[PDB]
Amino acid sequence: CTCVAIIMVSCVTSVWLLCRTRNLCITPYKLAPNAQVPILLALLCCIKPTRA
Amino acid sequence: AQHTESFTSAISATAWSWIKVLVGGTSAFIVLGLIATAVVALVLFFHRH
Amino acid sequence: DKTFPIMLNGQVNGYACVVGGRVFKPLHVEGRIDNEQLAAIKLKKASIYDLEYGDVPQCMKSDTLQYTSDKPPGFYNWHHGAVQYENNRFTVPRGVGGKGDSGRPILDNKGRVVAIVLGGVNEGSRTALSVVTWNQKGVTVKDTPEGSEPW
């Protein structure tokens, strides 16, 4: 029960850390619809690609 | 008979090679077919923008 | 120009334009063509690109010359007005955007077809058109806005 608590307290520090960096990905680029994202950060380093 | 005959007692080394050829090649010929449709789909998304 | 309405049950429901090398017809509409020499054209279904087979002979070839890429955002010769943007279609006013007039081409200032409309009945205050374009080197692109009913 301790072992499944260590994993669970470390899994909730993932979605508060991965999505925190993911929220800092696209909000500089969601405010610029006339700018093109780089393909290094579009697919590899961050998740959401260009949408039309 | 002193022994017990199993299910794979009669299959030789040549007959095992024809089984792997007639299964592995036909499985990869769909996998290549499945991966072919995953290439032009990525290409068509690049052509849209 | 040269465009052919599609005859279905006595009323007009679509326009079949012709480009130099290959004729066109909207897939989402149906009916009969209005030309005797276009009755031998082999009808086929295709993808969302609205692809038809232009097997017309040389007797009526080279009607409307196509336009290349690098389209300027200036004036364009729309049949009921004008379009003044490149990446998106211009916000055409109300009145235009009724029903049953798909496949109408968009002309250039040099008399060249650059696009074929497909849909966009009504979006509200303005109207966006789901139209086909050529992106960078001549590759055919189908472009659609959000919530575009076919028209």
Tell how far CA C98 is from the center of its chain.
15
CB contact under 8 A, C142 and B48: yes
CB of B32 within 8 A of CB of B25? Answer: no
Q: Which two tokens stand for residue C10?
A: 């006595």
CB of C106 within 8 A of CB of C96? Answer: no
Handedness of CA B39, C133, C52, C10 (dihedral sign): positive
SS3 (DSSP) at A37: coil
Residues of chain A found within 8 Å of residue B49, distances taken between Cβ atoms: 50, 52
- The Cα–Cα gap between C82 and C106 comes to 9
SS3 percent helix, strand, coil of chain A, rounded to 5, is 55, 0, 45
Report the DSSP pairing between strands C140-143 and C113-119. Answer: unpaired
C-alpha angle C28/C34/C39, rounded to 5°? 85
Per-residue burial over A30-49, b = 16 or more CB atoms within 10 Å of its CB, e = otherwise: eeeeeeebeeeebeeebeee
- Which residues 1-49 of chain B have a CB within 8 Å of chain C? 47-49
Size of chain A, expressed as the number of residues it contains:
52
What chain A residue is nearest to B49 in terms of C-alpha separation? A52
Most distant CA pair in chain A, distance: 52
SS3 (DSSP) at A25: helix
Q: Which two tokens stand for residue C47?
A: 């993808």
Told to judge if C28 belongs to the known catalytic residues of this protein, a careful annotator would answer: yes
Total beta-carbon pairs less than 8 A apart between chain A and chain B: 3
- The Cα–Cα gap between C44 and C46 comes to 7
Catalytic residue among C34, C62, C70, C102: C102
- The Cα–Cα gap between A2 and C57 comes to 80
| DSSP string for residues in chain B | --S---TTSS--HHHHHHHHHHHHHHHHHHHHHHHHHHHHHHHHHHHH-
| DSSP string for residues in C24-69 | ---SS---B-S-STTTTS------TT--------GGG--SS-B--S
SS3 (DSSP) at C85: coil
Interface test with B, best of C136, C139, C140 (most B CBs within 10 A): C139
Told to judge if C80 belongs to the known catalytic residues of this protein, a careful annotator would answer: no
Q: Within a 10 A sphere around the Cβ of C137, how many other Cβ atoms? A: 8
Q: Which two tokens stand for residue A9?
A: 């307290």
Residues with Cβ within 8 Å of C135's Cβ and at least 6 positions away in sequence, in order, are: B47, B48, B49, C69, C141
Residues with Cβ within 8 Å of C109's Cβ and at least 6 positions away in sequence, in order, are: C74, C75, C76, C77
- The Cα–Cα gap between C143 and C135 comes to 10
The backbone region for C50, taken as left when phi is positive above 0, alpha when psi lies in -120 to 50, beta otherwise, is left
CA distances from A23 to A7, A26, A27, C56 (A): 24, 6, 7, 55
Whether chain B has a CB inside 8 Å of the CB on C47: the answer is: no
What chain B residue is nearest to C138 in terms of C-alpha separation? B47
Told to judge if C50 belongs to the known catalytic residues of this protein, a careful annotator would answer: yes
CB of C14 within 8 A of CB of C100? Answer: yes
What chain B residue is nearest to C141 in terms of C-alpha separation? B48
